[PDB]
Design a protein around this ligand. Sequence first.
Ligand code: K0A
Length: 284
Amino acid sequence: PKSMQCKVILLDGSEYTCDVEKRSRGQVLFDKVCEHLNLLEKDYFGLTYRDAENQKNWLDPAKEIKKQVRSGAWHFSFNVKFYPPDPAQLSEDITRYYLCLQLRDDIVSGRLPCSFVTLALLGSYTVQSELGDYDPDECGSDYISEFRFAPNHTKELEDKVIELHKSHRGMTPAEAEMHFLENAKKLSMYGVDLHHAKDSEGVEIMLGVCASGLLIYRDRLRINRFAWPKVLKISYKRNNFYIKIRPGEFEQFESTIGFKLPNHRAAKRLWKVCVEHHTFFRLL
Ligand SMILES: Cc1nc(C(=O)N2CCCC2)c(C)s1
């Protein structure tokens, strides 16, 4: 039985290495990573890989790994796939912990925009969880944390993290992580997967996929929002992505909205993430 080496980047930035039989389905590798992580609430997570166009793709757990990575390296990341709208309802603290690690990367990367005060508050909960109670011995007037808190760090932001960290004395790691999540979950881009597209007129938009539905960001004025229950059919054809919006009360016909994606693979990827979100968030 021939086995392929897999390398998985974990949410703490470390690398997990294991072997699977070369015809293994994605679920096999995912089960190994999740056991390594002592993770039981596995439904929120998945593995990504980079395709031959260098795009992030979800590893389909039901399909052979080799028919997805194809010509590419067996290199993956472990990621949150479905961001829980109410992290307090997850059954395990360790689930909330991995969700915090993902969100920290969402913030530092700039995928999850955040005000100065919310960056400092989230940072303060991370420090409380990671180091425990504020200690002045590890912080003079010139302190800069090893923790990455933001896409761009300033001395002012470092100072505000410490000031709020001082307020959290006696907070336990699970408590600080829950506070982190209670704040993060409110951010307007929380759990929004953004896809570049053009509308039916050729105007550049972003489509966001999340728990509450599909978001169509045209400009700062008028953001179109469509709740999953308002969506009956999601389809792609060539470079095109279509959603079938259900008839409003007393309307005779479903309405169709068309988008142009960069290429056929980008349209299929958007279709699959929409179908998966619709199914997942239909059951929650
Ligand atoms: C507040 C918003 N930001 C974006 C955006 O283009 N983003 C790219 C990085 C994450 C956000 C929208 C589409 S709405």
